[PDB]
Each structure stands twice: as structure tokens, then as C-alpha cells.
Design an enzyme around this catalytic site. Sequence first.
Site, PDB file in Angstrom:
ATOM      1  N   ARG A 152      61.490 -31.884 -20.178  1.00  0.00           N
ATOM      2  CA  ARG A 152      60.866 -31.255 -21.372  1.00  0.00           C
ATOM      3  C   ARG A 152      61.741 -29.515 -20.841  1.00  0.00           C
ATOM      4  O   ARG A 152      61.275 -29.139 -19.979  1.00  0.00           O
ATOM      5  CB  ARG A 152      60.204 -31.401 -21.744  1.00  0.00           C
ATOM      6  N   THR A 175      65.718 -53.352 -29.017  1.00  0.00           N
ATOM      7  CA  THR A 175      66.441 -51.835 -29.558  1.00  0.00           C
ATOM      8  C   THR A 175      67.243 -51.873 -30.445  1.00  0.00           C
ATOM      9  O   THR A 175      68.395 -53.109 -30.065  1.00  0.00           O
ATOM     10  CB  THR A 175      66.214 -50.498 -28.612  1.00  0.00           C
ATOM     11  N   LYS A 226      61.075 -51.242 -17.125  1.00  0.00           N
ATOM     12  CA  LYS A 226      62.160 -51.006 -17.995  1.00  0.00           C
ATOM     13  C   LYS A 226      63.079 -50.505 -17.403  1.00  0.00           C
ATOM     14  O   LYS A 226      63.040 -49.376 -17.263  1.00  0.00           O
ATOM     15  CB  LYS A 226      61.391 -50.498 -19.401  1.00  0.00           C
TER      16      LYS A 226
HETATM   17  C1  LIG Z   1      62.492 -49.479 -26.750  1.00  0.00           C
HETATM   18  C2  LIG Z   1      62.791 -49.074 -25.345  1.00  0.00           C
HETATM   19  O1  LIG Z   1      61.420 -47.522 -24.998  1.00  0.00           O
HETATM   20  P1  LIG Z   1      61.357 -46.819 -26.119  1.00  0.00           P
HETATM   21  O2  LIG Z   1      62.561 -45.782 -26.554  1.00  0.00           O
HETATM   22  O3  LIG Z   1      61.104 -47.812 -27.623  1.00  0.00           O
HETATM   23  O4  LIG Z   1      60.310 -46.401 -25.472  1.00  0.00           O
HETATM   24  C3  LIG Z   1      64.522 -48.306 -25.631  1.00  0.00           C
HETATM   25  O5  LIG Z   1      64.561 -46.713 -25.493  1.00  0.00           O
HETATM   26  O6  LIG Z   1      64.322 -48.896 -27.062  1.00  0.00           O
HETATM   27  K   LIG Z   2      57.844 -45.470 -25.113  1.00  0.00           K
END
Ligand SMILES: C[C@H](OP(=O)(O)O)C(=O)O
Ligand SMILES: [K+]
Lengths: 519, 519, 519
Positions: free
Chosen positions: A108, A316, A258
Site C-alpha cells: 500500500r 468471482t 489461491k
Molecule cells: C476470491 C478472490 O479473492 P478476493 O479478492 O475475494 O479476496 C478473488 O480475487 O476474487
Molecule cells: K481475502
Amino acid sequence: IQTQQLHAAMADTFLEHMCRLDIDSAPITARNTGIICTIGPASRSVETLKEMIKSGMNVARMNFSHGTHEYHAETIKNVRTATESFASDPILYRPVAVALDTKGPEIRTGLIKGSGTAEVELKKGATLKITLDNAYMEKCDENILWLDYKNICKVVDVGSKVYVDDGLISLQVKQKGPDFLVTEVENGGFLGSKKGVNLPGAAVDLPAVSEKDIQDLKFGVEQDVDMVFASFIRKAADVHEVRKILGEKGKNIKIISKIENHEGVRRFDEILEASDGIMVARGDLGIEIPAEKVFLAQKMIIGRCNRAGKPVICATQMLESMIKKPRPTRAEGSDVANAVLDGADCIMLSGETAKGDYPLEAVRMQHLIAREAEAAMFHRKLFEELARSSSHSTDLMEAMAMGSVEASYKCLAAALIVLTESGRSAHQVARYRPRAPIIAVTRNHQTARQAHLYRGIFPVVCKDPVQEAWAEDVDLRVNLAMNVGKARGFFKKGDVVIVLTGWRPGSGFTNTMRVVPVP
Amino acid sequence: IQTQQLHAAMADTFLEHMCRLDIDSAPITARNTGIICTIGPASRSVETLKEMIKSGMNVARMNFSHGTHEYHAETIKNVRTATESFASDPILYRPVAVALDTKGPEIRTGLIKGSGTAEVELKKGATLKITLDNAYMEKCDENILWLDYKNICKVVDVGSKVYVDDGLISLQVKQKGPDFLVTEVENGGFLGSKKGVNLPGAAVDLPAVSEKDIQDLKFGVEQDVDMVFASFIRKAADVHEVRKILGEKGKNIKIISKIENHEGVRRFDEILEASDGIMVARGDLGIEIPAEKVFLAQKMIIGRCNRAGKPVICATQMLESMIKKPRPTRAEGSDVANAVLDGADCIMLSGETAKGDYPLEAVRMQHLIAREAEAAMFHRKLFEELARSSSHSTDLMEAMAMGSVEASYKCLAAALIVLTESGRSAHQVARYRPRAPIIAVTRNHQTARQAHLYRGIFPVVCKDPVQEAWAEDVDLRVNLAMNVGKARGFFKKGDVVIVLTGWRPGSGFTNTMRVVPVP
Amino acid sequence: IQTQQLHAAMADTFLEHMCRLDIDSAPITARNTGIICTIGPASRSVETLKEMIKSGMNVARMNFSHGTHEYHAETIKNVRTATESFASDPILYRPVAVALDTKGPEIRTGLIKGSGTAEVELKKGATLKITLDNAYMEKCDENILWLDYKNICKVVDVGSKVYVDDGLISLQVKQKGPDFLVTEVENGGFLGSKKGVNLPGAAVDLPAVSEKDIQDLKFGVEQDVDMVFASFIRKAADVHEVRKILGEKGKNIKIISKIENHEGVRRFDEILEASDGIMVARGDLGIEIPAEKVFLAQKMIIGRCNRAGKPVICATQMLESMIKKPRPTRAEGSDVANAVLDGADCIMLSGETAKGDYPLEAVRMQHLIAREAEAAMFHRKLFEELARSSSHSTDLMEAMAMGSVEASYKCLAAALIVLTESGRSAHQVARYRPRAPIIAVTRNHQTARQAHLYRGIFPVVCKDPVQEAWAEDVDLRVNLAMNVGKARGFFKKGDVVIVLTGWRPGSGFTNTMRVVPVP
Ligand SMILES: C[C@H](OP(=O)(O)O)C(=O)O
Ligand SMILES: [K+]
Ligand SMILES: C[C@H](OP(=O)(O)O)C(=O)O
Ligand SMILES: C[C@H](OP(=O)(O)O)C(=O)O
Ligand SMILES: [K+]
Ligand SMILES: [K+]
Ligand SMILES: [Mg+2]
Ligand SMILES: [Mg+2]
Ligand SMILES: [Mg+2]
């Protein structure tokens, strides 16, 4: 007219398979793609939950990018309540999992001209300088930009890119210093205070886990969460870290890595090997890599996972338009059908059920498209393709999976019953894509909760105590599944079912398989 | 790292093919997928048109459900103006086609409060009376609604549903009258003026071709439109009438029947047999049939067309997010890429380019994705599949087509170069789905405009005059292709192309192939 | 280097598979192809016979074209003697089958010049008026000829060919009479006395079975034969007659229709259906049809039988060299091995074991080859192809036979164990072509005998009385197969095996499947 899209199932080729898809060919009652609903304000109430639980919800996801422990703890508390409002009947009782969606590491900017409510305007082809001089920490303006990533220089090089405020602003490094960089606004806009920074194409030093991450994981282990959706996973090393944090108390908690950037992709193999499942975070991914290349990443990630027998989740913007309307776009319905078709274990709803005006309607829609697409897959060819990939394996439980599935196609079984405590046995099967539902009967709750991650698995929880005799206990658990299936409309009384169990108590895997008719 | 997904290309299995897609395999410059834009307010200008011709536009579509004949005629001249503005360089000139999208059997409401502007908030569970009394034609208010379908009363029955405004507004027939219908607002929203009515599960006795249609039809004839999109085609028959109405002066106008409802799907076969092409009308189809089943239709049709070697257009909601946002969803990028992969010759943009605020952005996107997906196809298997499908034919042009495609896969030709006037010789090749761009060199402008309809054909018009000696005339157009290809960025000096020509004048088809190097 | 040609089995393509065959990839102990030996002078002794069983014999064939019943009944007795010589050890005992081979209906000439030893000279271009005049019956001269085939006029038109002396003399019917046939000699030789005729491409009227055949059959019935190789089958009606004859007493007798001619080939499908199995009588076949074409029929005949699940036997001249040499030609090795690859269930020896100097040397050779060819097959492909062709079947037993076979390849089982009394449940698995041996455990003798007819099946007879407790009777029987396998050297202690059993007595078919380890 033939149901469950059977006539296409006989196509010798892929083009012919497509060519026979018939919209007059009814799907079946059962849906195999799990639905992961994001929980919030519009879906947080208990009553709402019961309904959502009723519409097809299988996994409650908790987004820890926000909220306080207190909030979540509450959300979590309602789920459970809603969920359990149905245990009165072990038959109509459907388990629901719980997911902790980690906020993770971030980059950030500082304060703009001191205010947190200020803006600076960045124009095209402008020189904007970024520094690590703690001074500007609150004095960021348009000529000087201050970051919170100490090693920004070591990781980036001349000509790389920086993306401020989530893709909006982009800058090309046109000079590399030791504690500053000299960028050229390229594709500028409006800059604000404390906005997210992205370094596509880079190898970010950033720790696996944030300080916040840690109290969040602890909190999950405490809350007895079924799994964890881990952010910004870049390598295998990163996975081990969350693994550590979970410690011995949550060794059973599933880690779903992820995929969010170049790295995660380019090193996907090492991440898959170390993860318990995988997530296609189309969202953050779309920022880091070009949007036109997203579909590449999504199919490759899914194949790879399918091929390796590790659950993969597509997430998403699936039904986005639906946050504000009662009906999805044609692209939305197509996004959903295709995901499944690609072989996703499960699909998800973010905004749609969290913030939206039509959360129930969103669940139902996913529930609906999935069944249709599930019948439009090409079992016969996927199955072979799948088997050939695993030829290197001579595992026994695999062998029973394969033979069980083939038989299920041959005689058109209505379902496959599997008794298991670990779940591995059923996971093995699911991995092979029967067309029919795999009704797994477990006495272990958690096992039943994490089963959803798999395609086809409809977990049923046995609340009855252990009989004196295996035969009887085995035959009880079976009846349970038969009653449940009869009531849920999966099958009638003359249907044929495939049954997998253990020859004797403590066998190792379901090493027994019979073709039994629904009583 | 390889280019064009050539690595995924050698996969032996589909799954493996997917497993190897790589976000770092750079595509080729070329775009084989037709991009069709809907012209209107946002893109009607000339300067905008030129900008959209540069970006990627191949086909301008005039939506005849709106505007006066004098409006289109204008839109049409602007298209031509823009188009011809580049006719200085025979090389850097790109033909643009023109389409007449028909209105057909549409159902519309009346004026909300005499204003064309005014909306009215329909509420759930409320009562709304539908009448046929023309006094109401302009008194359409929140309690009384007027439709332009006289026999609506005789085709609908109690309990039936009525969908207004793209299925957003849902009304249930609670009572039947003789001139009216008592409905209950099953699903409300804001009811605007002159909006689309769908009567799912009803037999609309409206004729395919209506009086207005005729004018419109005749008008297009007058205007020299390249093809027509026949709205609401339900039977082979309907497609004949258009042909008739079109008569002898419009014989070469290509007719693209639009699949927009249940019956249309059912008699797909006969309809296809009578059509020059086909378009998948997502919007209407998605209301006429369940939203969940649309993707089954999209695949069957494309399969079926592809098999038959007839253009198919995928349309509607592909990039909707973009009418108002510079960025498409994640689901959108899917759709498109998936439409390209499904095997569609062209993709379309309706509002994204008609009203939208980012019309130019919409195109670049569809273009961006199209190349990517394009390389992500599985040629080999597709090729094999296509071939088997057309086993019964011994045609020498197909035969010629198959070999050239096969030779191009093998040597990795940069482009296939064809010389045709009818279009046929190039159409037969595009049907085999080469990987590489098909540069078709014609002397017939129209054959070149309508070429756009085919996957891979990049039309090139030879302005030069017919050389006396064949050899020279051939050698002549080949050099044009060469230069053009060379000028576009497709090939270079050491490149290798495949050249299809007639041995002698009046050969009948291209009966001579040659593996020649770019000069 | 990997055993059983397993490298090659992982080939994705047939060309690769072939390319991967290793002379150093050792076969397995177990042979799958049944070996049919024709008993005669050279091997009619109990001593020789015992050595033959040891050596590999599975079925003893009695060619009724010869000998008297006295002979046969005795030859038979000796086979039954030898067989039982091993009955002392139930683990060493090996069932042997007895087949009766019919002389079948024929066509003969009359006497040549009255004198039976008389030999006339036929020359080319001549003229041979063959007549049905009993007059000539004993004075068949170089000008005139006599046949037993009364209806030969009815059956032969002009231009049709007639073969004399196992095709040595070809005669063309240049002019048909009412009871004579004026034939011009095409290819002439030495017309001897009492030669058999052949009417290539003719629709022979002749009875299904001759007067002799009838006696022989009833005899076969009294002697408790296990299967009958019916000769000269041309239609289904013939098979049908043969059954009539065997009647009720010989209902369990399998009938193996021998395909000796154009018709029988032509109406192949009707025969297959009516028969319990088929035999490719190359001998007669290559007389009636052109040699260059024999291979076509054998391949077709066999491909078709495999498809349907009917045992098939390939015969005649596989190892003819061996009649007088102890070592076969390079060409006979291929014949045997190819037939094995083509998929023959059984292989056959005639004069090689019935009159040759090297009987045992011949069986031994057949056994070495079959084991080797058997590893060389491409089971994965074959399996897929077989499954596709049965796709129209949703049979519980095939399903079961299918999952099993598949699991077997998956974990590389060393065998499949099947408990059966009908033998059907075994047949089913066999049809699917596993790689490992199929150990069938029956309590029914005929079954055990008849089972050799099938590839993979290795019948084991269970002499121990029925237990009262189902599980015990089953396990007992399972143990036997286990002991035997371990003994014959099929598997060890470590080894995995698939067990097929009935859940309950009177289950109808083997509805239970299991993966078990050799104890
Ligand atoms: C689900 C995943 O992580 P988020 O942005 O929801 O933390 C996304 O980028 O869609
Ligand atoms: K998250
Ligand atoms: C394109 C087709 O026709 P339209 O509704 O645009 O007139 C559709 O229904 O989407
Ligand atoms: C072997 C078969 O039958 P056979 O002649 O032995 O009766 C044949 O026709 O060659
Ligand atoms: K229209
Ligand atoms: K015989
Ligand atoms: Mg993130
Ligand atoms: Mg429409
Ligand atoms: Mg014969």
C-alpha cells in the site's frame, strides 16, 4: 426423448457430442458441483441461511479481508444454527462447511498531501517518483509516491510495471535507484490514499502470511473451520507456512491455495503438490495478468487439478449482474456452464450472495446451470483421458474407483454408494467422474463437511451408533443412503445402484463392490 | 517458451491439451474470428466508424427493429464513407460488410404516459391489466398495459406467464377476458415504454415476414446490403419467403436465419438446410427457453453448423458490463473465448457499440481474446472430427481444402493464400479450420465483404486489371497477398505460405497447391 | 526390462505399441489361448496322451471323417484315462475336453473305368460331360463323369465353376443340361476315382447333416461329448437341424459351426447367432474360396465373434511343417502368433498331432508362441473397442465383468477369480479380454470342460462338498483357486487378485467384486 443427455453420451467424436445436445433432454434431480456462497449482510441472517441452505448452499465462505473476529464469530454462529435446524431428520439433514478466506499480504501507498480523503491527478506520460524515504509516508503527492514494501527495488527492474489502485493506474519504471524508482505514468488517472499496489511479472519477497493473517488463522482453528482459502500463494514454500501456522491443532483443516498472479501460475505444479485443493481467483488474477489470458490460466489450472485428483474451485463474477437484477446475462449463464464443463469441483458466489438483492435466486441459478452442464459432459472420453494420465499408478483404491465407475456407466446406475471415514475412498471415485451421484456415508462430521470440495459427493452423516457386527453396521449405513436417495428423489425402487464398502472392519479402503437394486 | 499454444497443440488428449495451455505462449498478430458491430447512436459517426474499422470491425449491423428508413440509409453511407476513406492503398484497405437485421414477429408495449421517456415502477404481487384497446396505446400506465399483439388473448391461457423487457418483468395470467388479461406482478421493476414481450410456452400466430419486413427487405435490396439476418425463423418455410421477397435482384444477399425460440431449435435442421448461415440469438432465446438451457443450444448449433460448413454467429450479452464500464467481467472474457473455442465464425456486440460509452474498448477486447482463444483451439482433433463428419463427400474442392490445411499444420505455414471470385474455394478451406490466416484474394467486392462471415478469411480486393496472360494475373494477385500479408505483420521474408490457385483459367476451383516462401 | 510387454502397453498409438515390442520382455507363466489337439495314431496312447495334457492340450478332437465308432470310443476312453490320471491331486488336475467333429455332407464321383484304382487324364480345353446317369456310376471316363449330387443341375447355372479332387481340377460349366453338365476343363489334372467335389459360390441343397452324421451324433450323445464341431454350415437352419438331432439329452452340448464356404461366410451373422461358437476351417475354406482371401475371413470371422462374446477357433496348417520336422517354419510362427493377436480363443492342431512324427513337439510350440503373442496384444485399445461395440447393452453381468477387467489392468492383478456353475459369469469377463488369467471355480464338470473354449479361462474343479454356510462354501472355493494359482506359478504371496463371487446363493450372477491379496 432421452434424459440426462444420453444420446450425446454415445457420440463417437467431440463434434458429434456437441451436435446432439438436446434441450429437451431432462437432467437429473441430483447436482454434483458444489456451491460456495459468500456470506454477509444479505445472507447473514439465520432464516436467510435456512433458505439458502435449502436452495443448494454447501459451503459458507467467510471473507476476512474485512470484519472483526466478533462479526465473523457471529456469522459463523448463524450458519451453524441454520444448518442444524434440520438435524431433527438425519435424512433431510444436509451438512454445510465453513471457509476462512484469508486477507493475506499487501502493498500500500501513503497519505496523499497528508489527507486520507485527498486526490492527486496523474496524467499520461508523467514522471512520478517512488521512494522509501519514511518522510513522504504521509506526504505523497503527484511527483512523489511512497510505498510500504521495503524491497520494491530488489524485485523490480528497469522497464517493469507497477499498478496502483487495482489496475487503474499503471506505471513503467524508467529508472532504477536503490531506494527510489523513476516511473513514467502510462495509462494514468486519479490517485488516492492507501491504495493497493500490484507488481505483475514479479517475484514478490512478501511473506506468505501477514501479521493479521496469523490472528485470523488462529481464530479459524478456534472456530473449528473446515478449511482455509489462502491468499496470494506464490510457491510451495508459502503453503508450508500456513501449514505451520495451523499447527497440530488444525492439521485436519484443508488448505486451498489461491492463484493470484504470474508466479502462482508459472509455479503451479509445486503449489498443487503442496495444496489440498486449489482456487482460481479470477478476480485478483485478472489484475495481475491480462484479462484475455485469464481463460488460459483457468483451464490449465483446472485440467492440472482434475488430472491430479485435487479439488479446484472457480470463483468471482460468475453471476455478477445478479447483484442488482433477478436474471443473469447470457455470458453469465455461459460462464457457469463452462466452468463445470471444464471440470470444476465447485463454483462460487461472492457479491451475489454477500451484498446482493437476490442471493437466493443466485444460488438456485447456479444449482440449475450446473445440472444441465453436468449432463452435457462427455463421460466416456474424459474417463479414458483421465485413466491414461494415471496409468503410472497401480493404487488399489484407484483400481476400485475405475472399475466402479465403468460399471456405473455400463448399466446406468442411479448412484454410487460409498462408506468412508477419511473420505479418500470416495475422493478416489469422484476423481473419476461417474455420471451418477456418489452418496458418501460417514460418521465423522468433518469428513462430511469437506467432501463437498469434490464433484459428485453428496455427504450423508450417520448418527447411529456402531453395531456389534460389521455386516449389520455396514447394512445400516447402506439403508440410510438408500432412504436418503429415495426421499431426495435420486432414485426409485427399481433402480440399480453401485455399492462400495469394506470386506471387514478396518479393511483400508472399500475393496468390495456390488450391484444392488434399490429396495 | 513456444508460441500459439504449439505446445498444447501436440497434446495427445484433450485434458492434456488443456493442461498445457500457457499464458506465456504469445499469439499471432492475426484474428480469424469475425467481429460484428451494431451501429447506432454511439458509433454512428464517421470518425468513430473509421476508428472502429481500424480497431477490428468487419460487419456493421443495422437493427431494423428501430429507426426510420432515412436514418439507416444515413448510418449506411457513414459506414461506406469510413470504409472507403482507406481505398488509397489497395494494401491498407479493409472491406466492411453490411447487414440488415429484421424485426419480424416482435411484441411491444405502448407508451408509458404518452412519453417515450417515462418509466413506471411495477410492484410485486400487484395487479396489472393488459388490454388490446387502442385508447390505451399511449396511456400505458402502472395499472393498464397495452401490447401490439391482437390475438394474444386467444393464444394465452390462465396461469401462463408474460415477460416484459428482456424477461426482467414477470407477470402471471391470473384472469382471462376477451380484450384483456388480468395479471399479477410476479416479479416487478421499472416498466419503460415500447418494450419487448415474450410469451414463453405459446404459439404465436404472427407471420415470419410481415408487411414492414417486406419494405425493409426491399429497402435493403435497394441499399446493396451483403446479408440479412432473418429475425425469429421457425421453419424452413419462413426462410423461403425472405428469399422470395428478396427475389432475383437480391439472390446473392446472404440470409442468416436467427434461432430465437423453441420451435426454431426443434426444426434447426430444416432451417439450416435452407440457410446461408445462422445466428444464435441469445437474448430472445434466453427468454423463450430457460436460461439454463441456452448454452446447450449455442453448442449444438455451432457444432451442427461447423459440421455443415455454414457460418454461425454467436450473439448477445457477450460484453454487457462494457456499455457502462471500460472493463468487462471475468465471466465475459470467458464467454467470448468460449464462443471462439465452441467453433463460431463470428462474435457480436449489440449495445456495447450502439449506446455504450466504450464502444471502441469493446472491440479491442473481443479482438484481444479472439486471437488467444484461437490459438487455444485443438486443431488436430478438430480436423480429424470435421473430416469424419464429411466422409460421404468426395468433392475435389474439399479434397483440395483438406490437404492444404494438413500441409499447413505440418510446415507451420504462416498463411494460406487463396484466389477465388465466387468465394467457394476459400470457404471450403476455412471450413477445415486452418490455424493460419486465410488471405482470400478476390476481384469481386461483394464476395469479399461476405467473406467476413467465414472463419479465418481475411479478404483482399484486387483492383488491378486482368492481365492477358494467366500466369501473370495469378502471379499478380499472389504478390498483392504477399505484400498485404507482409504489410499486416503476418509473415516475413523467410516465411512459408501455401498457395491455392486455378491451373488454367476456368479451372472451376483451386486445383493447384504450392508451398512457396515469402519473398 | 519390463515383463509382459508392458512398455508397449502404455503406447498411445498402435504404431507406437508395435514399435515398443521387446524380445527381452518376458512373458508370464500362464497361457490364455485354448489348444485343440486332434487325436489319432501318433497320439492315441494313454502314455502319449498324458504327456499331451502335461504339454498343454485342452481339448481332444475326434475327426469323425474317419474311423469306426469302435475306434473313437476307444480313443475317447484313453483320453478320459490320461485326464484322470492326475485326479489324485486336485491342485494338479486339469480338465480336458472332448469334441466330436462331423464328417459332414459331401459330393463324390463315380468309379473311373470300373476299376477303383483307375486314374484318367484330364486336359485343358477338353470337354467333360458330367452326368447323373447311374449308368456311368462305375464307368466314369475321361469323357463322362458321375456325381452323387442329384440336384446339381438345379444348383449350378452357366459359367459356374466345379472343382474336382480338392480343387485340383477346375471345370467350367459351359452348357447346362437337365441332367448333364457340359464343362470345359479349365486347369486339368488326374481325375482319380471317388473324389470329392466342390461347387464354389453355390447354394447347396444338401442336408444339414448326413445319415452318417446322424448316427455319429447320437453316438456323440451317448459318449457324453462336450461340444460338437458341426461341418459344412451354410445357414442358421443347419445349426438348427443339428440341435434337433442332439435333442433333449444333448442340450448342454455346445455346437461349433464350421465355416467351410462362400455361403456360410456370406450368411455369417445368422449362423453366429444360432451357434454356441465358430470355427474357421481354413482347410476347406481355401478350397472353396481363393487363398489370397482366406486371411480376410479369418479376420472378419474372429473380429465378429469377439464383438459378440462367442468362442472362436482358428484351424488347419498352423504348424504343418512339424508333421515331418521338429521345428516349424518362420511362416508358421507368425500364423500362430498372428491368430492369437487377431483374437482367436483357441488354436488348432490336426495332422500335426494326429499323424505326425512330432506331436508333443508341436503342442509345446503352440504354447510358447501363444504366451508371447498374448502379451503383445494392446489391451487398452481392444478393451475400449469392445466396450464401444457393446454399448447398446446395460447388462448387470457385463457391467460387473467390465469393472473387474478394468480394475485388473489398473492394479496389474495377477489373476481374476470367478466362482461359477453355469460358466456364464466367467464367459462375460473373458469376452472382455483381461491380461491376467481367469481362474474359474466350478463344481460342474461339463462347465469346466467346456470353459476351455474361452480365452483366459483356466477351469478348476471343486470336488469338496457344499458347505452349509454360504460364506464358507465361497471362501473354500476361493482358497482352492488361490492354492492352485500359487502352485501353477501364476502368483505369489504379495500378489493382488480380483475376486468375483455371488453375494448370496441364488444371486444369478457374480454380483460381488473384490480386490484381495494372495495369502
Ligand atoms: C476470491 C478472490 O479473492 P478476493 O479478492 O475475494 O479476496 C478473488 O480475487 O476474487
Ligand atoms: K481475502
Ligand atoms: C440478436 C437477437 O435479436 P434482437 O433481440 O437483438 O433483435 C436477440 O434476440 O438477441
Ligand atoms: C479342419 C476343417 O474341417 P475338417 O476338414 O478337419 O473336417 C477344414 O475344413 O479344414
Ligand atoms: K431485430
Ligand atoms: K470332419
Ligand atoms: Mg488479493
Ligand atoms: Mg431478438
Ligand atoms: Mg468339408
